[PDB]
Swiss-Prot record, chain D:
Keywords: Ribonucleoprotein, Ribosomal protein, RNA-binding, rRNA-binding. One of its GO terms (cellular component) is cytosolic small ribosomal subunit. This is Small ribosomal subunit protein uS3. Belongs to the universal ribosomal protein uS3 family. Part of the 30S ribosomal subunit. Forms a tight complex with proteins S10 and S14. The gene is rpsC. It holds the Pfam family KH_2. InterPro entries: KH_dom, KH_dom-like_a/b, KH_dom_type_2, KH_sf_prok-type, Ribosomal_S3_C_sf, Ribosomal_uS3_bac-typ, Ribosomal_uS3_C, Ribosomal_uS3_CS. One of its GO terms (biological process) is translation. NCBIfam families: rpsC_bact. Coiled coil: none annotated. HAMAP family: Ribosomal_uS3_B. Binds the lower part of the 30S subunit head. Binds mRNA in the 70S ribosome, positioning it for translation.
From Swiss-Prot, chain F:
Signal peptide: none annotated. Keywords: Ribonucleoprotein, Ribosomal protein, RNA-binding, rRNA-binding, tRNA-binding. This is Small ribosomal subunit protein uS7. One of the primary rRNA binding proteins, it binds directly to 16S rRNA where it nucleates assembly of the head domain of the 30S subunit. Is located at the subunit interface close to the decoding center, where it has been shown to contact mRNA. Has been shown to contact tRNA in both the P and E sites; it probably blocks exit of the E site tRNA. Protein S7 is also a translational repressor protein; it regulates the expression of the str operon members to different degrees by binding to its mRNA. One of its GO terms (cellular component) is cytoplasm. Belongs to the universal ribosomal protein uS7 family. GO terms for molecular function: mRNA binding; rRNA binding; structural constituent of ribosome; tRNA binding. The keyword Methyltransferase does not apply. It comes from Escherichia coli (strain K12).
Length: 127, 98, 100, 206, 83, 152
RNA sequence: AGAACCUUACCUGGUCUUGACAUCCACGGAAGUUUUCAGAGAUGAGAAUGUGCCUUCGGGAACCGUGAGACAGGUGCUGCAUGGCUGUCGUCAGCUCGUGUUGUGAAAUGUUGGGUUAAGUCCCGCAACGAGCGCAACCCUUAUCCUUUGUUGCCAGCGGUCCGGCCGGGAACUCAAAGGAGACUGCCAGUGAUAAACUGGAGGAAGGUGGGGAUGACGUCAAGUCAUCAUGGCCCUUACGACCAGGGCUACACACGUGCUACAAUGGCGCAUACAAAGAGAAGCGACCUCGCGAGAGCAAGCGGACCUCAUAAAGUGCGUCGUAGUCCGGAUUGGAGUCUGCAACUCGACUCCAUGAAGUCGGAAUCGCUAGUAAUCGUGGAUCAGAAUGCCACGGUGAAUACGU
């Protein structure tokens, strides 16, 4: 049966399904290479399944929403790691030791009154 | 079939209103769908707090509006008549459409 | 502000809503593309006849209590000072200090 | 430095609003204008009735006004001959039918507005401010108040230079949000100018 | 500027005065406060004293002036130089 | 700082070489937060240099790296109006940082047609001690050599 | 938080005197609707019309004109006569009181001493024993999971397809909004004065204040505000009050502050194609279709909104060109032709098209901001508003270098 996972990163949310298969990867009804023209995004997506070495032994069905490119790739990481946990529990310490399981909570800070940006101040003169 | 939309600045009051409406509708015999919570609206204001100059000293205020939807299916002629006569609490805006 | 300014605002509102319909009809005549340029000339000459205070653009938003012509907010009808004063006493329903 | 309004910071926590109606953008300014006129009028007539707060509510195309007073008998009149005339004038002002309710304030020495008004009246009648401030603090504390602070500032005693003086007893933790604080102010027009009075009263934690 | 479909702009009282002057010979110069009014070919040969804020500057309309407005020929600022 | 609380932040490896040091180089070369441009530029230059050399990108980059990195620097120390120039050692991580920074800054100042060509030419020159980066390293070494009388 | 007229408080000219804005008395009285002449308008004069509405037929009076004064009016002066409100030291860790004791006394102790903390935070000892305002906690938002409800929101497993979650359907999932759990130095090891605490490790989404906001003690600067408002005293009353038109606040040998756009190849230009968040909408937002190169014009659905409109995100990616030149960089100034708002774009609005093509090749002495989703860079929305942002207030994309130390 399909094993489920959910990932979130920045402003992006992704949902992942994993089943036995011959290595197919589908994202938003498109191939892996079609969706992400950037190579870093590709290695980002493929890191978890390569650490445990079941690349061609599984089939992945993924959709994403919101954010940009790297945020969507990070959400995909989080979802695939959670689905792999739900498919096998003996791997938990291995992926925790690689930092894949921690959810990245870094957001963007709000603008504040009196400042040009979150932290940049206007130019100050003594006289 | 009836749509009912409730608006309020406070959620406790509107929750009590929705509870009494749905219980009244269900005691008549019709069936209900809901309540469904629609997105809350936030309106923000920023003002200067000094009578003269001092640009960087300001206050910021917020108004929240809560909104929920209830659907009545298989209505009885007694159901609607009991629905108007409910006399919902003041401070809750009620819209009923068929 | 001065009482004269408030009197002027009241008079401007009166003239505007008294002449609204006639201004609308003359402006509609002028704005039309299928017409006679002689009729357009007559309508232009007639539009100038009305008192200037009947234009809605001649009115300035002001605080309902003090008459301050700067810092208005359309939602409440008050300037910043009076909005803060009333809002701090709980006289404006649903309004409170924000933080996010 | 300056301090935040004690009432404003607790509206979502312990203190309730004085107006409890809903409206869209097209009605909002008119509703506040009518409320302002109604409150100003009821303040004008009922000065010698010791009214603390006027709560205005708008059920549907109508209005309901509840006044809190320490002398309900003088407000009511003779078998209600005054409530009806006040109701009719409010209906005239607001443009809708009205209904008026009277709420009695037990122990009127525990309400900040009443104490402020009393101190203002005493200052108008040429009473030494220390005398009145000490009486206010003693009267409030004898009735079980957990704390009270009373501040008077201005051109005290007709001096050439103004100053500020205050007295305090008990606990008045203004930085604690959940605490119950009643804060209110008043102004006195003496022969030399204005004198401002502020009162904080601390009642309970939750 | 002024949209083509609306034509030019002229003041009714000024137009009346101009016509009454032209039909009755070249009379005295015409005082006016209207500076937003464009110049018509009927105005040629006339002398119009336009207000500038404090006084009335005489303008003698020629065939070259048709199309512009009267206020273009009555400066409102006085400046000689610095130092 | 006065507190001494910070630690160290994690860096990702480069896309198609599996190396952290190249990722640091790309970060040093990046401007305005446009990482893709910097990584494409460095990849093109490394490919061109590997073609014109024949060894690889990795050890060619390394060989250029030993020829620019420093071994001892100076620090100022005010005494009575003037300053001591005291010589101190450099940690290896700082050695790598200074080498890369000097390399990039020297390469940015050239008259070629593209930044990739500039970087490739400069780094090939530095692989055998001919560029401005090695001149800066020699100057630092000489200045640190002069003032060793204060090296406690 | 937005000066063409108005705003307007200033200038010139033309006009008023119980008065532009309230109360008191006497008299002729509907309220309003079209009108004409003179005038820049203020205003003056004139022409028809409804002349009522509860009403003891006495009228009371929504509200128009005249006559006097008691008065109205003042953005006139004094923030060094004042209230209220705000800036700053400074989100710095401080500031006091009752009783007792010490000193002739101003005063002192407590609040000092050893450790420790972000902290007058905590533990121990102590002629002090207790208490208050401050610190911390209670409040909002973000990061993990749980339960309830499924429309306008969702589509894992099934049936049909015009390939449109489009339809039938499902309540698993994203999501929405109410209610809960969770993080507490809780556990393990070592140091420590068995204390407070400090260094490390396990589990976990998160570890020692997890991140951000709100919250500003006693007071200082006779700090700012009589022009938001309120107010003592002084001052003017055919004028320092009032109405109207036109002008000015937009000037221009010069000096400074805060910004935007550049001086290019990590780029300019052309063609094709991906991925957001937050917000507003009825004298309003405005699709589709037609015309125009363009700003726009005509007709006209839908929406008081998870439904409709605003409204294709940009940097990015692939292909081609330009090949270091004051240039296919830069877009100031100037000429011609228009659009829209508005009674009215001369002084003095924004925008479109054609033509023109200035200084500028990285900036002297000096000087500013920033410790992470930060700096840097790229787009989007809102208030004010008939029209008029490079400013202000908010929202997301990409995403660094360095901190040995005092
Ligand atoms: Mg909305
Ligand atoms: Mg006034
Ligand atoms: Mg305006
Ligand atoms: Mg003006
Ligand atoms: Mg003051
Ligand atoms: Mg003694
Ligand atoms: Mg102390
Ligand atoms: Mg002491
Ligand atoms: Mg001591
Ligand atoms: Mg100590
Ligand atoms: Mg303490
Ligand atoms: Mg705190
Ligand atoms: Mg751990
Ligand atoms: Mg740990
Ligand atoms: Mg001063
Ligand atoms: Mg002062
Ligand atoms: Mg001053
Ligand atoms: Mg002044
Ligand atoms: Mg004027
Ligand atoms: Mg100015
Ligand atoms: Mg160009
Ligand atoms: Mg060049
Ligand atoms: Mg051009
Ligand atoms: Mg810091
Ligand atoms: Mg941003």
């Amino acid at each position: 049966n399909q094993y489920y996972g959910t990932g979130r990163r920045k402003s992006s949310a992704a949902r992942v399904f994993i089943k036995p298969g011959n290595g197919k990867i589908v994202i938003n009804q498109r191939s892996l290479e079609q969706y992400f023209g950037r190579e870093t995004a590709r290695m980002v997506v493929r890191q978890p399944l390569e650490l445990v070495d079941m690349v061609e032994k599984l089939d992945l069905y993924i959709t994403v929403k919101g954010g940009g490119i790297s945020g969507q790739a990070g959400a995909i990481r989080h979802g695939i790691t959670r689905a792999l946990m739900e498919y096998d529990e003996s791997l938990r310490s291995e992926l925790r030791k690689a930092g894949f399981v921690t959810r990245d909570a870094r957001q963007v800070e709000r603008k504040k009154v009196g400042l040009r940006k979150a932290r940049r101040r206007p130019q100050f003169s003594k006289r | 079939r009836i749509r009912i939309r409730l608006k309020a600045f406070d959620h406790r009051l509107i929750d009590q209103a929705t509870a009494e409406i749905v219980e009244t509708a269900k005691r008549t015999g019709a069936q209900v769908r809901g309540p469904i919570p629609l997105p809350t609206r936030k309106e923000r204001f920023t003002v200067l707090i000094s009578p003269h100059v001092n640009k960087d000293a300001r206050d910021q205020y917020e108004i929240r509006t809560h909104l929920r939807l209830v659907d009545i299916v298989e209505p009885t002629e007694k159901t609607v008549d009991a629905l108007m006569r409910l006399d919902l609490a003041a401070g809750v805006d009620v819209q009923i459409s068929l | 502000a001065k009482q004269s300014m408030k009197a002027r605002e009241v008079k401007r509102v009166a003239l505007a809503d008294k002449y609204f319909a006639k201004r609308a009809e003359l402006k509609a005549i002028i704005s039309d593309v299928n017409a006679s340029d002689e009729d357009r000339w007559n309508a232009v000459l007639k539009l100038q006849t009305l008192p200037r205070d009947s234009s809605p653009s001649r009115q300035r938003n002001r605080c309902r209590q003090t008459g301050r012509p700067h810092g208005f907010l359309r939602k409440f009808g008050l300037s910043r000072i009076k909005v803060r004063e009333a809002a701090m006493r709980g006289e404006i329903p649903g309004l409170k200090k924000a933080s996010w | 430095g300056q301090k935040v309004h004690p009432n404003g910071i607790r509206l979502g926590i312990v203190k309730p609003w004085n107006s409890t109606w809903f409206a869209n953008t097209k009605e909002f300014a008119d509703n506040l204008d009518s409320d302002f006129k109604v409150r100003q009028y009821l303040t004008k007539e009922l000065a010698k009735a010791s009214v603390s707060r006027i709560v205005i509510e708008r059920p549907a195309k109508s209005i309901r006004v509840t006044i809190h007073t320490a002398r309900p008998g003088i407000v009511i009149g003779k078998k209600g001959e005054d409530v009806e005339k006040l109701r009719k004038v409010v209906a005239d002002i607001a443009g809708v039918p009205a209904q008026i309710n009277i709420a009695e304030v037990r122990k009127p020495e525990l309400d900040a507005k009443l104490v402020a008004d009393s101190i203002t009246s005493q200052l108008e009648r040429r009473v030494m401010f220390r005398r009145a401030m000490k009486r206010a603090v003693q009267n409030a504390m004898r009735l079980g108040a957990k704390g009270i602070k009373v501040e008077v500032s201005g051109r005290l005693g007709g001096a050439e230079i103004a100053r500020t003086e205050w007295y305090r007893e008990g606990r008045v933790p203004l930085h604690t949000l959940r605490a119950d604080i009643d804060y209110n102010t008043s102004e006195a027009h003496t022969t030399y100018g204005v004198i401002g009075v502020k009162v904080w009263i601390f009642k309970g934690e939750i | 500027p002024r949209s083509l479909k609306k034509g030019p702009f002229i003041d009714l009282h000024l137009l009346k005065k101009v016509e009454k002057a032209v039909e009755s010979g070249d009379k005295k110069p015409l005082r006016t406060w209207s500076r937003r009014s464009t110049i018509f070919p009927n105005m040629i040969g006339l002398t119009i004293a336009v207000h500038n804020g404090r006084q009335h500057v005489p303008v003698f309309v020629t065939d070259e002036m048709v199309g512009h407005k009267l206020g273009e020929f009555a400066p409102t600022r006085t400046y000689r130089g610095h130092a | 700082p006065r507190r001494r609380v910070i630690g160290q932040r994690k860096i990702l490896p480069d896309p198609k070489f599996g190396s952290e040091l190249l990722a640091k180089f790309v970060n040093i070369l990046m401007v305005d937060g446009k990482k893709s441009t910097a990584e494409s530029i460095v990849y093109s230059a490394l490919e061109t240099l590997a073609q014109r050399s024949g060894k690889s990108e990795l050890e060619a980059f390394e060989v250029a790296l030993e020829n620019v990195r420093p071994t001892v620097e100076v620090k100022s120390r005010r005494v009575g109006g003037s300053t001591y120039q005291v010589p101190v050692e450099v940690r290896p991580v700082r050695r790598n940082a200074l080498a890369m920074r000097w390399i990039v800054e020297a390469a940015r100042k050239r008259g070629d047609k593209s930044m990739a060509l500039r970087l490739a030419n400069e780094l090939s020159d530095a692989a055998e001690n001919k560029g401005t980066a090695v001149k800066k390293r020699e100057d630092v070494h000489r200045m640190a050599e002069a003032n060793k009388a204060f090296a406690h």
